[PDB]
Amino acid sequence: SGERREIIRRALNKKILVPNILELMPAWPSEFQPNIDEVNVEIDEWLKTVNVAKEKKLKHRARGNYTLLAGIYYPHCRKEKMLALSQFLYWIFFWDDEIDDREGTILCCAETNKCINDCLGPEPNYTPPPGSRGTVEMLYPILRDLRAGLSPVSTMRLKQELHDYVNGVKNQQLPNPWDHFQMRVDDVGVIPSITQNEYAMDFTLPDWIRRHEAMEEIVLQCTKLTILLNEILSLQKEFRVSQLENLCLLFMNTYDMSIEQSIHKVLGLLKDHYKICIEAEARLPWSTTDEKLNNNIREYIRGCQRLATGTACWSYNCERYFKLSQLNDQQELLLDLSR
Ligand SMILES: [Mg+2]
């Protein structure tokens, strides 16, 4: 932790201009669900019922505005689907925030995993146990509404992915950068939002295509790309609260890279994984005859891409990570690791 102090020292008050990450994924457009505004109104009415601190809810609604993120993740869904999808993102940010006490983390993950089993398992019960904490209580109806619009095929995936997320977060309690990177792969809750594209677009991907090596690769690359652009876009926010386990800082620590080189290395990894992913599209088992099947493969991988581009584009349109003033007229971001 002299280790800590030296990272803090080597990056304090550094200012780093970041190129528009969207440009690094040039073939993948960002779009906006056209009913975001009417959904936020309903999301606003709904949040009044959520047993979370009004001031915590508003900070998330104002600076996070996760309905806008859902609208970028699922820009082509119908508005009726937007409600549950948005509700889901408020849950995962409230829950993730409520964690960031070993005893209390263990207890909360156990209750959350139980909620997931109770809602998405084979003997469903959508009634929260009495005394449930607010971030667990709210999840019960949200998983129920999502389950109502998924096939059991997609349901089963969302169940595992959520469990994986929860258990991942329970298991986070200076790491080698590659160690940090890989556990974020088998943790971060991007893959639940790939599966929720099935809910949004009212289709199911057959397991046999999902297990195909190109499809798995595409999911892994878009998960990796989401993590990588998030490592850069969140460096300011986490450095200021001395969350020093950020891939950039960890490249600084392990390899004695400058922060500039470190960010630059992350930007190259992005470019690498973006081309790996594009190449995987050629190896997908596209059908010669089945249009609907091929329309299902297309929407699925569009959800994968939109998760990387959407995470970036949303971050460029909300204040969760930096103040939007920090963007120049080229969507370039001046990080300011001042404190
Ligand atoms: Mg982050």
Side-chain angles (χ1 to χ4, degrees):
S1 318
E3 196 167 57
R4 304 206 114 234
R5 191 97 209 177
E6 279 188 22
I7 279 299
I8 293 176
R9 175 161 101 69
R10 292 158 44 178
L12 190 57
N13 314 307
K14 271 279 202 219
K15 276 173 291 229
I16 319 100
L17 188 69
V18 193
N20 186 7
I21 282 157
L22 284 192
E23 297 248 77
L24 279 64
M25 290 163 301
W28 299 347
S30 314
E31 311 166 82
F32 294 90
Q33 211 276 338
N35 310 126
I36 285 167
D37 285 346
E38 331 156 47
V39 175
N40 250 334
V41 169
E42 308 184 312
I43 276 296
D44 280 336
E45 260 289 315
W46 163 76
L47 278 153
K48 277 187 291 205
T49 68
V50 170
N51 299 317
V52 169
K54 168 160 163 316
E55 73 274 12
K56 177 164 143 204
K57 297 190 279 181
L58 185 103
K59 177 159 93 170
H60 281 275
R61 168 67 168 87
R63 293 183 346 113
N65 186 13
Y66 309 119
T67 301
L68 170 65
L69 166 62
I72 304 161
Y73 280 161
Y74 322 101
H76 298 295
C77 69
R78 309 232 311 264
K79 63 162 97 134
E80 284 88 0
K81 304 275 174 173
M82 284 294 287
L83 195 60
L85 301 163
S86 285
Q87 283 164 336
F88 179 84
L89 290 155
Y90 273 85
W91 165 70
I92 208 162
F93 280 93
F94 288 157
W95 195 88
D96 202 273
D97 174 8
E98 213 204 81
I99 295 269
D100 284 88
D101 195 6
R102 185 100 289 253
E103 162 138 350
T105 296
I106 307 298
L107 290 183
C108 175
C109 291
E111 300 154 13
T112 311
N113 274 322
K114 178 194 166 51
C115 173
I116 293 148
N117 260 292
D118 279 343
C119 293
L120 310 178
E123 291 201 17
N125 165 45
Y126 304 112
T127 304
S132 291
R133 58 180 80 211
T135 51
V136 166
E137 189 197 352
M138 63 178 295
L139 179 64
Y140 275 90
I142 288 171
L143 292 195
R144 182 208 54 216
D145 296 356
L146 288 180
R147 185 179 192 164
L150 296 162
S151 76
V153 170
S154 317
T155 287
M156 274 183 34
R157 298 202 281 256
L158 188 65
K159 192 178 183 310
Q160 183 143 53
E161 294 167 9
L162 288 183
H163 280 318
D164 286 350
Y165 171 60
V166 183
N167 293 329
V169 155
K170 171 194 77 183
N171 282 329
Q172 335 162 316
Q173 292 77 264
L174 266 173
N176 161 279
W178 304 112
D179 272 339
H180 161 91
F181 185 46
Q182 251 75 61
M183 207 36 191
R184 291 206 71 195
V185 168
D186 283 284
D187 163 283
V188 86
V190 309
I191 294 174
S193 302
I194 301 183
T195 289
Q196 280 169 70
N197 197 31
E198 299 186 83
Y199 171 82
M201 293 313 267
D202 206 330
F203 76 102
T204 309
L205 195 73
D207 167 60
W208 73 266
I209 297 141
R210 174 58 174 88
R211 295 314 130 202
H212 191 279
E213 63 83 14
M215 182 58 90
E216 300 216 317
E217 179 86 274
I218 283 159
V219 170
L220 178 70
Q221 296 323 298
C222 290
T223 291
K224 272 155 136 79
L225 288 161
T226 310
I227 293 169
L228 289 174
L229 55 85
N230 162 260
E231 288 299 351
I232 291 169
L233 297 161
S234 67
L235 176 62
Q236 188 177 283
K237 170 183 189 272
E238 295 165 8
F239 186 78
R240 280 171 183 182
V241 300
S242 323
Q243 289 201 7
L244 301 187
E245 290 159 58
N246 169 289
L247 182 58
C248 310
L249 305 178
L250 293 181
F251 280 139
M252 286 190 66
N253 175 51
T254 281
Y255 296 119
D256 192 38
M257 307 181 60
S258 69
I259 188 135
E260 287 96 346
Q261 289 171 329
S262 174
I263 291 170
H264 185 263
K265 194 190 205 294
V266 174
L267 288 166
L269 294 182
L270 268 149
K271 285 155 90 186
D272 287 350
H273 287 295
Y274 163 74
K275 193 84 49 192
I276 288 174
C277 186
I278 289 268
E279 264 136 33
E281 290 172 50
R283 314 197 303 289
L284 279 157
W286 304 96
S287 160
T288 56
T289 62
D290 203 328
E291 191 196 29
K292 175 65 171 218
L293 183 63
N294 276 358
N295 275 358
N296 275 21
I297 295 173
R298 284 157 183 146
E299 190 54 45
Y300 198 87
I301 78 184
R302 270 163 205 170
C304 289
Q305 301 153 352
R306 277 171 204 144
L307 169 78
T309 57
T311 306
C313 173
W314 161 69
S315 320
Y316 286 139
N317 280 295
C318 84
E319 306 218 275
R320 173 183 164 84
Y321 300 106
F322 38 78
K323 282 166 132 203
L324 291 171
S325 78
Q326 305 185 230
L327 284 171
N328 70 22
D329 308 327
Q330 270 105 302
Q331 193 148 287
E332 270 147 46
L333 172 73
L334 186 60
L335 293 170
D336 188 359
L337 310 178
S338 301
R339 290 212 220 178

